[PDB]
Each structure stands twice: as structure tokens, then as C-alpha cells.
Amino acid sequence: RRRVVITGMGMLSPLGLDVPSSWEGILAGRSGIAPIEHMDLSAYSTRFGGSVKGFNVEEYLSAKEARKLDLFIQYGLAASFQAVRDSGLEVTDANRERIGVSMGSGIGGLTNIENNCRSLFEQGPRRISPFFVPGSIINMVSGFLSIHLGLQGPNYALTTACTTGTHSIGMAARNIAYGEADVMVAGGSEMAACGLGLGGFGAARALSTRNDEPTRASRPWDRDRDGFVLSDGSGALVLEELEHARARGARIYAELVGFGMSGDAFHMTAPPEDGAGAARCMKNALRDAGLDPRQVDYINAHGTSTPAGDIAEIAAVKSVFGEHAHALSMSSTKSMTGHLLGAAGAVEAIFSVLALRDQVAPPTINLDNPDEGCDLDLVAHEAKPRKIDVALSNSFGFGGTNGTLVFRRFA
Amino acid sequence: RRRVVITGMGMLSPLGLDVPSSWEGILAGRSGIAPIEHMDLSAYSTRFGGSVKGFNVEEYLSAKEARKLDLFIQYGLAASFQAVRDSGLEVTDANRERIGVSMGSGIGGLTNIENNCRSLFEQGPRRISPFFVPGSIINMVSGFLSIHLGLQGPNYALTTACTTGTHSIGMAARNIAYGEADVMVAGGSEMAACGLGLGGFGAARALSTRNDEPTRASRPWDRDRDGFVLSDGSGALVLEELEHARARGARIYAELVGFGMSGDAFHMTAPPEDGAGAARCMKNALRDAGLDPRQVDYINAHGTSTPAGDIAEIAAVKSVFGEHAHALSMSSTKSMTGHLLGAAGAVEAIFSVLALRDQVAPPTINLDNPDEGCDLDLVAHEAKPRKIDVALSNSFGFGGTNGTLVFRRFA
Ligand SMILES: O=C(Nc1cccc(C(=O)O)c1O)c1ccccc1
Ligand SMILES: O=C(Nc1cccc(C(=O)O)c1O)c1ccccc1
Ligand SMILES: [K+]
Ligand SMILES: [K+]
Ligand SMILES: [Mg+2]
Ligand SMILES: [Mg+2]
């Protein structure tokens, strides 16, 4: 098993059109949530969310290449191209077989699907776009990235709702550790803010309806939370074998030392109150990393601002970490970004690596009145400079699908 | 790295509602393709496909449980429950943490998506079903299976178009080899025969339009092929660590010895004419298995009945296998079943294991006039009893995403 490091990163989020802009918002405690302007939601129960603002796909692709592609693919490609540029890696005939891709999505091309269904119902099947299928199916992020950059290694795509970006990064790391690849571009992307998306989640009563104050909507572990905030964007990491990164003089942000999974096997959307599945997942990830719970300094929580979800994670952290639960810092950056679904674990793995780089825990904004038992250091309200040698990122997603990543300062 | 064996299998296909019925059709050279009766396609350019005929979800779930679920989830669960029953494994508090799930889908709940879009456009967002999202998103096969059986191990879902079932099985095997699990239920499911699906693929000109003779439509490597046939169904395998299977006295069908991946990085739907990516994938899988190409007896091809696709695989087999390309037998069971997309690699991994069990290569039906260079033993027309110690199953899917599995008689 070879060591795996992070050498490039890329992002579109509700806080910015790249990583440094996003992270500057994060550390300032800025909200990226606002009334949605890209469509008319006056008929809907939730009318706000986390949108990517001012994205120009022409920075990344020709007009010819871009018109075929759903926004979730456009966003995954943007993050991907940023991460490859940031890495400095040169792709050649000598290494292309050894560079793969694993970009995922929770729901994929819902906008294109809705628009092609309109054509179908109103006009007939021959009005469907000839690019509908390739521009909309989930594995075409990985497909198009590999074609655009000539990447010939392992090529696949995860779809695990809120855990997508976490699993994608973890499994890509396993590719590298196993010797299937030397480099992987991994992460996720999502653009589910169409009528079907907001309508669908609203019908399931999953979303906050705090339409009067959108920036106060996402409030993880706060007694007045009322559901998650739907957000859009992408994240991508360049994962690299350690000897390969060193031989080319790559800048190394951090090491990816552990990856853990479990299933709650409990309920379609609420975890058990004791967070038993989440606990097993975190332990699995710590043990994969060869770390004791006392070695953990920062956790970037799943923390979506849901009743059952948020408290289960508090219970799970207490179970795993014992008295040390009170020494570590845990925060939910979803307090500012909302829930990017398939891209959540990607952008949050980035925020974890950057907490390492900058020695600072990002805040949980809006944490005005912590609920019963929510008495840990949840970094309420403002960023906390502190020693961080080891950072976790948790994703405890729809269906009870759990993943945890463990990153460490590189030495 | 621990050894991984196959101890149970399950399926819905166009040939049958379980594995033995399907396989009996396969060995008889029966076509499962017919005009579609479940919806009116008189407005469409392709009006036939491979449908699951006479499925009764009540054999598997209560009416309450089933009404929430898209057919692709119903089908994945059916195959899954069959495979667990076939395995004989008892799930307990002692082993549940060690049993996981990886069921995938290429497109997922397209029928539910279309129906909820109608409600949206005609009536408004509050008419969307409250079960739309959990009953339609791809990871809910794995989610619902884990909740129904209490499976607490690794829980995730692949989405890689035609390669989905292959990757799902391969990666699940890696879980077991790595020690993340002792048992995985793996495979895929698909029900893309709605208006959006047939319309979408027809707009992309991907489908045969041989409406006058549907059973003659799917004709891999035949000079008069004109596109793939869309088919529905599911497959699932119970994968198990070898010591665990032996300790309980499990019946072992075969061993899963290798798994390989690559990306063509060439084109959104056509592979390169020389099948260079497919060759690398097969070599990767053989090398993972510690096998020489001369040890291969049977290949269950990708062979979807497309111009570019089918010939690339012939070129790739010649490249990898040299003169031995003429000694092995290769067939495309899609000649009878059509292309089950995300379920293709699952049902075809099953057919590969059964070729091992029964010492017989299934036929490529309709192979009347083999195209230029298609001069291998493609098992044209009728089944061929022969020695088979090692069987490959290939999936060379949309975006250039390739996967190969290697199974061997167990000793
Ligand atoms: O498209 C970008 N970069 C890019 C695209 C394809 C390949 C590379 C590469 O370095 O190999 C790249 O940097 C890009 C555009 C805007 C901001 C950052 C990266
Ligand atoms: O539902 C089936 N079986 C089933 C469902 C849930 C658990 C088990 C089990 O053995 O643990 C099972 O066999 C079933 C139904 C028809 C045909 C084959 C299996
Ligand atoms: K997280
Ligand atoms: K196959
Ligand atoms: Mg560059
Ligand atoms: Mg049983």
C-alpha cells in the first residue's frame, strides 16, 4: 500500500468561483445562500438556495463543447480543470495510462432531463436533443474529462447522494494505494436547482422553508433548524502517489491517510438517534489511518441542519472520541455553503485540507442556541485558529450511506 | 489479499424471472426481444426491446413497500433477494457489520422522473410525489437492500453506463480482498424503457430500428447490425471471502480472480477501431488474476451490435491473445437479451459463472454474415459444449469506460 497525497484542488461553490475565493468566504463566516434568480420559484415552498454566481463556462470550454453539456457536467469539468492546473502535472504518453478519473453526482442532469421531458410531452420524442443522453448521464463527467485531457487510467463514477464526493475521493485513493493508478482526479458535482429538484425535495419535506431570512436557514445543531439548504457546485482533487509527486517536485498540500465506510441499515432518511452507523464509519476510517481518536484535531461534519441527522453526529462523535470529544473542534461548513449533495464531500475534503494548511477551524455560523446535548466545540460563529495535525470529513447520507476521510499534515 | 468466491446469484431478464429460466433460454438460443407492450410506442422510431415479462413485485415486498419504488429499484431488490436466498447465508448481529452492498444503475428512475415532471408541468410542484426522490435516486437500491436485510457494511452505488454491473462486482470484490467486508451483494439494475429513454436513445441514433423483425435486431459482429437493443432487468451476486464461505459449508459456484479497468480517452460513444483501451483493460484484468492469455477459454463480450463498438473488441481480443485468439470461444449474449445497460455486466457475470459450471459457451445468435475481420470462434448460432476453466466478461461502455472481470473454476 503506497501513500497518497493531495497536489491540486479545484471548486465552484456558492461562495466563489475557485478555491481561494471560496475559502476566504468560509473563514469570514460569509453565507452563500440567497434567493434563487436563475428561475421563477414564486410557486414554490423553498425559494432560495446556494447558487454558483457568475460562472463562465467559456473560461474552460469552447461554445461548441459546452452547449452539449448539462450544468452539472460543466461544473465538474471546471473544478477538474482547475485542480489539474493547480497540480502542475504534465500529462504525456508516458504517464497517461496511469492517470484516472472518478467524478460523481448525486442526481446528475436533472435540468436537461426536465427540459427534454417538456419537448417529449408537448411535441413528441423526435424533439428530444440528440445530445440528451451523453450530456446528462452521470458517468459523462469522468467520460468527458478523460477525453479532454487524454486520461487513460481507471474511469468510473459514484452516485451515493450526500456521500458521493467522499466515496469518490476515498475509492480513488484506494486505486492509487493498490497500484491501479498513480494519479486520480476525484470528487463530485451537482446542479439540482430546477423545478423537479426543489419541487422533489420540497415534497419530501427535506428543505428549510426560511424564505424570509435565507442566510439564517442553514443552522446545524441549532434548536430552530428546519431542514437542509440545496446548493450547487463542484469540487475536485488531484490525488497522487507520494514517490510520483516527489519525483516531479510537486507541492503537497496534505496526505490522505484513511478512508472508512458503513451503512446504518436503519431508515431511508433519518439516522438512528445514537449515530451508531456514523460511529462505526469514523472508527473504520481512523483504524485505516493507524490513528488513535486522541490524534484528531478537526472534524468537518456532515451537519446538514436537519433534526435527526445533526444530533446523531454529536452522539457518534461522543461515542468514538470519549473525553477527547471535548478537545477536538467540529464544524459544519454547510452553515455557509448549504448542502451541495454529490459535491458536498468534495468541497468539504478541500476545506479540510485547507484547515490543515492554514491551522484554523472554519466556523459553524448561525449556531445561536445549540440543541440538547450539542455541547462540544462546534466552532460557533467565528473561525478558530488552533493546532490541526489531523482533520476528518464526514458524510452521512440518504439511505444511511456513510463515509469518512482522514487527512494529515504531510511529513 | 483474500480470495473471493461466488456463492449466490439472482436475476430478472428478458429471458426469465430468475437465473435458471434465463440461462435455459440462453443455452437454447432464444431471443427475449419483442414489441414493447407496457406503453404506446406508435409515435417512435424503435418500438421493441427486452422487457421483463410477468414480474410480480409482491413475491418480494409488501404492496406498501413497493408503491414507493421505481421499477429499477424493484428489479434490483428482486435480484438481490434471490441471490441472498441462493447463497443460504444467515444474517445475524454477529456478521451484519461485515456484509455490504454495491448495486448500481446506468440511468436510474427515469420512469418516475418522467411521471413527476408531468405532474410538475401540468399541475405544479406540490403535485410531485413525496416519495419521488427516495424512490428514484440511484443509491436507493443499495439503501433499501441494506435497510430490508439489516446489512451494515460498505454501502455505495456505481453509475458507469454499460460498465456499471462490472465495476460494481469488481469493486465489491476489492472490498472483500482489502478486508472492508466479508460478504458483498453486488450488481446492477435498469428500467429505462419509458418515453424519455427510448426517445433519448433514438435521438442519439444509438438503437436498432429493425421494427419488422425484433428478434433479428441484435446481431453482434454481423455485417447488417444497426445499433443496440434496449433491455430491462437486474442481476446480483453474493460475493464472499473464501474462508468465510468454507466455514459455513457454502456452495461455491466459481472464484472471482481478476478485475481490470481503463479509459479509451477517445470519443463519447465510439471506441477507437483498434480497441486499444479494451486491450489494456483485458490485460490489466489478466495480470490482476495472475493468468497468461493462453489460460482463457471463454469471453462473454460487450458486443452490443453497434458498428464501431463490435469491431474494436475483435481487434482488442486479437491484440491481447495473439494466435490464442483463435483457440478461445467469445460470444455476445446481448444477441438474445439485448443491452441491459447498468444491469448488463451483472447478468453477463452470471452467464460467465454458469458457462464455468456447465462447461458450455453460450451462442451469439443472428451472426449470419460476420463482418470484415470477425473470423474468431464467436459461437455463432448455437451453444458449444467445451472445456472452460477461465471465463472473462467485458464491458466497454459509453464515454470509453472499460471494465473486465475474470472468473475461474474453483479449486
Ligand atoms: O481550463 C483550465 N485549465 C486547464 C484545462 C485543460 C488542461 C489543463 C492542464 O494543465 O493540463 C489546464 O490547466 C482552467 C481554466 C480556468 C481556471 C483554471 C484552469
Ligand atoms: O424475497 C425473497 N427472499 C428473501 C428476502 C429477504 C431475505 C432473504 C434471506 O434469505 O435472508 C430471502 O431469502 C425471494 C423471493 C422470491 C424468490 C427468491 C427469493
Ligand atoms: K464533511
Ligand atoms: K460481457
Ligand atoms: Mg498543466
Ligand atoms: Mg436466507
- Cβ < 5 A residues, ion ligand 3: A 300, 348, 393-394
Same domain, yes or no: B69 and B206: yes
Contacts of A264 in chain B (CB under 8 A): 146, 152
Contact B400 A143 (CB under 8 A): yes
Instruction: From chain A, pick out residues whose CB is under 8 angstroms from the CB of B227.
Output: none
* Ligand 2 center to B148 CA (angstroms): 11
User: Please, are residues A235 and A347 in contact by the beta-carbon 8 Å criterion?
Assistant: yes
Q: Helix count (H) and strand count (E) of chain B? A: 12, 14
- Å between A221 CA and nearest CA of chain B: 24
Distance CA A155, CA A152 (A): 8
Cell matching residue A249: 517536485
A139 to B400: CB separation less than 8 angstroms, yes or no? no
Cα→Cα distances B16→B26, B34, B210, B367, Å: 10, 14, 23, 23
- The answer to whether A80 and A17 are in contact (CB under 8 A) is no
Distance, CA of A129 to chain centre = 30
- In this structure, the answer to whether residues A238 and A272 fall within a common structural domain is no
- The partner residue sitting opposite B133, judged by closest CB among A45, A118, A204, is A204
Q: Which of B258, B274, B306 is at the close of a domain?
A: B258
Helix (H) or strand (E) holding A282: helix A276-288
Say if residues A315 and A366 touch (Cβ distance below 8 Å).
Answer: no
- Say how many CB pairs under 8 Å bridge A and B: 276
Residue B89 DSSP one-character state: P
Chain B, window 184-213: residues with a beta carbon less than 8 angstroms from a chain A beta carbon? 195-196, 198-206
Q: Check residue A381 and report its DSSP letter.
A: S
Using a 6 Å cutoff on CB, does residue B58 contact ligand 2? Answer: no
CB of A87 closer than 6 angstroms to any ligand 1 atom: no
Range of the domain at A17: 5-258
User: Using CB atoms within 10 A of its CB, is residue B121 exposed (0-12), middle (13-18) or buried (19+)?
Assistant: middle
> Are A172 and A307 contained in the same domain?
no
B162 assigned to active site: yes
Please give the number of the atom of ligand 2 that sits closest to the Cα of B148: 6
- Cα B81 from chain centre: 17
Bridge partners of residue B404, in order along the sequence: B260, B394
B268, A171: Cβ pair inside 8 Å?
no
Alpha carbon of A59 to ligand 1 centroid (Å): 9
Q: Do B117 and A401 touch (CB under 8 A)?
A: no
The Cα A14–Cα A12 span in angstroms is: 7
Q: At B186, which CATH number? A: 3.40.47.10
Does residue A144 share a domain with residue A116? yes
How far, in Å, from the CA of A384 to the mean position of ligand 4?
54
Residues B10 and B28 in one domain: yes
> C-alpha grid cell for residue A166?
467522499
Residues A223 and A279 in one domain: no
Cβ A81 under 6 angstroms from ligand 1:
yes
Task: Please tell me the residue having the least CA distance from ligand 1 atom 15.
Answer: A60
Provide the number of structural domains found in chain B.
2
Contacts with B171 from chain A: Cβ below 8 Å: 171
Rounded to whole angstroms, the Cα distance separating A225 from A303 reads 11
- In chain B, whose CA is at the least distance from the CA of A160? B139
The full 3-state SS of A212-260, as one line of letters, equals CCHHHCCCCCECCCCCECEECEEEEEEEEEHHHHHHCCCCCCEEEEEEE
Contact B263 A152 (CB under 8 A): yes
User: Does residue A167 share a domain with residue A245?
Assistant: yes
Q: Whose CA is nearest to atom 19 of ligand 1?
A: A82
User: How much is the CA Rg of chain B, to the nearest whole Å?
Assistant: 20
Contact B204 A132 (CB under 8 A): yes
B59 Cβ below 6 A of ligand 2: yes
B133 Cα to chain A: minimum distance (Å)? 6
Do B103 and B215 reside in the same domain of the chain?
yes
Residues B113 and B191 in one domain: yes
Q: Does B2 touch chain A (CB under 8 A)?
A: no
Domain match, B243 and B297 both: no
Query: Is position A31 annotated in a ligand binding site?
Result: yes
End-to-end CA distance of chain B: 17
Question: Which residues of chain B are within 8 Å of residue A104 when distances are taken between CB atoms?
Answer: 159
CA distance B357 to chain A (A): 30
Q: What is the DSSP letter of B179?
A: T
Q: Tell the residue nearest (CA) to atom 9 of ligand 1.
A: A85
Same domain, A90 and A64: yes
Residue A59 Cβ inside 6 Å of ligand 1? The answer reads yes
Q: Provide CB contacts within 8 A for B377, sequence distance 6+.
A: B326, B328, B329, B330, B384
| A1 inside 8 A of chain B by CB | no
How far apart are the CA of B380 and the nearest CA of chain A, in angstroms?
A: 32
For the four alpha carbons of A366, A225, A106 and B178, in that order, the dihedral sign comes to positive
Query: Do A180 and A245 lie in a common domain?
Result: yes
**CA–CA separation, A329 vs A336, rounded Å?**
17
* Residue that terminates a domain, selected from B235, B258, B281: B258
Contacts of B174 in chain A (CB under 8 A): 174, 178
Atom of ligand 1 nearest to the CA of A87: 10
List the single best residue of B155, B194, B228 to mutate versus A (max A Cβ within 10 A).
B155
**E-strand stretches of A288-386:** 298-300, 329-331, 360-361, 384-385
The ligand 1 atom at the shortest distance from the C-alpha of residue A86 is 13
Method for this entry: X-ray
Resolution reached, in Å? 1.7
- B328's grid cell: 478461445
Cα B284 to middle of ligand 2, angstroms = 36
Map residue A280 onto helix, strand or coil: helix
Q: Is B144 in the pocket of ligand 2 (CB under 6 A)?
A: no
Dist. CA B238 → ligand 2 center (Å): 13
C-alpha cell at A82: 482547475
At B10, which helix (H) or strand (E)?
strand B4-12
Domain ends where: B220, B241, B258?
B258
- The stretches of B29-163 forming alpha helices (DSSP H) are 63-66, 71-87, 110-122, 140-149
Helix B276-288 vs helix B307-321: crossing angle, to nearest 10? 50
CB A168 within 8 A of CB A345: yes
* Count of CA atoms in the C-beta half-sphere (13 A) of B235: 34
DSSP string, B133-171: TTTTSTTHHHHHHHHHHT--S-EE-B--GGGHHHHHHHH
Buried b (16+ CB within 10 A) or exposed e, A46-69: bbbbbbbbebebeebbeeeebebb
- Residues of B within the annotated binding site? 31, 215, 335
CB B296 within 8 A of CB B286: yes
Q: Does A126 touch chain B (CB under 8 A)?
A: yes
The number of beta carbons lying within 10 Å of the beta carbon of residue B288 is 23
- What is the distance between the alpha carbons of residues A107 and B181, in angstroms, rounded to a whole number? 27
